[PDB]
Structures are given as C-alpha cells and as structure tokens.
Amino acid sequence: NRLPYFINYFFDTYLLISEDTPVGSSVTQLLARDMDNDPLVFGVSGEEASRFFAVESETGVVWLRQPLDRETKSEFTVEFSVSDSQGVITRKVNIQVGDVNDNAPRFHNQPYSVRIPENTPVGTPIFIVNATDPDLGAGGSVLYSFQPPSHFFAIDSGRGIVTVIRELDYEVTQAYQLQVNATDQDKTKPLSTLANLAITITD
Ligand SMILES: [Ca+2]
Ligand SMILES: [Ca+2]
Ligand SMILES: [Ca+2]
Ligand SMILES: [Ca+2]
Ligand SMILES: [K+]
Known part of the structure; x- marks a missing residue:
C-alpha cells in the first residue's frame, strides 16, 4: 500500500478566501491521488480550523461554518487530512483573508x-x-x-x-x-x- 497525497496549488502557496464569503459557500475542493486507486476520506483538524471550516469526507469540498473578518484575523494556518482508510496524511495550508x-x-x-x-x-x-x-x-x-x-x-x-x-x-x-x-x-x-x-x- 502507497500513502495518498494532496495536489492542490494552495499547499505550496496559500488559499485566498474573501472575508465576505457567505456562511455555507464552498471555498475550494481538496484534490488527492493514490497509486492504488483507493477510495479517499478528507478531513480538517485544529480546534480553530474546525470552528471555521468543514470538509465533505467523500468529495473533499471545503465550506465555511463561520464569517471571516480580515480586520479581526487576516491569516489562518489550517490542517487538512486525507486517508486511504489505512494511513492518515495531514498537510498545512496558509489561508489569506481577502479584503472587502x-x-x-x-x-x-x-x-x-x-x-x-x-x-x-x-x-x-x-x-x-x-x-x-x-x-x-x-x-x-x-x-x-x-x-x-x-x-x-x-x-x-x-x-x-x-x-x-x-x-x-x-x-x-x-x-x-x-x-x-x-x-x-x-x-x-x-x-x-x-x-x-x-x-x-x-x-
Ligand atoms: Ca493507498
Ligand atoms: Ca471586516
Ligand atoms: Ca472602508
Ligand atoms: Ca475589510
Ligand atoms: K487605511
């Protein structure tokens, strides 16, 4: 068994999210690969990360649970998980809160x-x-x-x-x-x- 891995650009740079992103909006979709073509389980960890973002476990869709406000907090470090239902791989994403x-x-x-x-x-x-x-x-x-x-x-x-x-x-x-x-x-x-x-x- 070979462990899965993320491929989204934002793992290497940052994910930009407008502070007026409405609660419920999809902000992005985690994409991952697995040389065994296994089915994949996506997740998010962190007290803070989990209060702000939810992750559809099947689809990798990330949506917003709470309003962002650049003037209160202009950046987050958030941890996303992908599992091949055998090993859990976690990886950090810098999030830039965009101004309106x-x-x-x-x-x-x-x-x-x-x-x-x-x-x-x-x-x-x-x-x-x-x-x-x-x-x-x-x-x-x-x-x-x-x-x-x-x-x-x-x-x-x-x-x-x-x-x-x-x-x-x-x-x-x-x-x-x-x-x-x-x-x-x-x-x-x-x-x-x-x-x-x-x-x-x-x-
Ligand atoms: Ca695998
Ligand atoms: Ca604001
Ligand atoms: Ca103003
Ligand atoms: Ca503003
Ligand atoms: K100013």
Missing part, C-alpha cells in the same frame, strides 16, 4: 471643538479632523467634507484641515454647529461616518 470594504471611517480625539477670535483672518487654519479606515486600497482611503458645505469654513479633503474662508462677526454669530463627513473611496459601496465640530467665537 466593510468598515466606515473612525474619527479620533473627539469630541471636536475650538474657540477662535472674530478677527481670525481668511485662510487661517483653525482645526484638524482625523479619521482612519482599516479596509485596504480605495476602501481604506478617507475624504473629508462638511455636510452640508459651509459658506464660512472649508475642510481640505485629503488632510482634514479646517480653514476660515469668509470674515466672521461676533455681533451676528457666537457658535457654529458643523458636521464633518469622512467617506472612503470604494468604487461600488463607499461607507461614511459623521462628527460634530463646535466653533465658539470670542471678543
């Missing part, structure tokens, strides 16, 4: 507020907003704006720097309620978050 855009930007150092004088010249930068997005590429890449846009203030869309763009007036207005929007730039489903910025005016 599933996080909105996250503001930092809130609550946001600044006090400025009314004579504050046009152009003067008065505040820095900061939001991070953990997704990759366009989905992880933050743009800033006011919602709605301001007649009196502006925010650099790259850097989140708030400037004064028209002369203020204490006799007329003492406060400003201002909503900052931070969106990511995912092509199909951009996500966004909102923050208050409070601007007191002094004499």
Whole structure:
C-alpha cells in the first residue's frame, strides 16, 4: 500500500478566501491521488480550523461554518487530512483573508471643538479632523467634507484641515454647529461616518 497525497496549488502557496464569503459557500475542493486507486476520506483538524471550516469526507469540498473578518484575523494556518482508510496524511495550508470594504471611517480625539477670535483672518487654519479606515486600497482611503458645505469654513479633503474662508462677526454669530463627513473611496459601496465640530467665537 502507497500513502495518498494532496495536489492542490494552495499547499505550496496559500488559499485566498474573501472575508465576505457567505456562511455555507464552498471555498475550494481538496484534490488527492493514490497509486492504488483507493477510495479517499478528507478531513480538517485544529480546534480553530474546525470552528471555521468543514470538509465533505467523500468529495473533499471545503465550506465555511463561520464569517471571516480580515480586520479581526487576516491569516489562518489550517490542517487538512486525507486517508486511504489505512494511513492518515495531514498537510498545512496558509489561508489569506481577502479584503472587502466593510468598515466606515473612525474619527479620533473627539469630541471636536475650538474657540477662535472674530478677527481670525481668511485662510487661517483653525482645526484638524482625523479619521482612519482599516479596509485596504480605495476602501481604506478617507475624504473629508462638511455636510452640508459651509459658506464660512472649508475642510481640505485629503488632510482634514479646517480653514476660515469668509470674515466672521461676533455681533451676528457666537457658535457654529458643523458636521464633518469622512467617506472612503470604494468604487461600488463607499461607507461614511459623521462628527460634530463646535466653533465658539470670542471678543
Ligand atoms: Ca493507498
Ligand atoms: Ca471586516
Ligand atoms: Ca475589510
Ligand atoms: Ca472602508
Ligand atoms: K487605511
């Protein structure tokens, strides 16, 4: 009797699985060979491996038992088994969890507020907003704006720097309620978050 062996590329490199792979989806099919043409039993071992993946014992079909989340865990080492019902052969697979855009930007150092004088010249930068997005590429890449846009203030869309763009007036207005929007730039489903910025005016 000669022991069976896996032939899938991913035993030598890695298996890529999108984090939005739905529960129940088949992620792949283990392929193995046996010079005795024996029937073959496929399996998965590991506390962690078995909570995430199930293996059809007859067909080698691997399906997902639990949602993946790249931002929680971007890699697994998983152990697959194939048996010729005489000896058990185990072999490790590195799993890369592929990104989708599933996080909105996250503001930092809130609550946001600044006090400025009314004579504050046009152009003067008065505040820095900061939001991070953990997704990759366009989905992880933050743009800033006011919602709605301001007649009196502006925010650099790259850097989140708030400037004064028209002369203020204490006799007329003492406060400003201002909503900052931070969106990511995912092509199909951009996500966004909102923050208050409070601007007191002094004499
Ligand atoms: Ca065999
Ligand atoms: Ca995620
Ligand atoms: Ca993601
Ligand atoms: Ca995102
Ligand atoms: K990022």
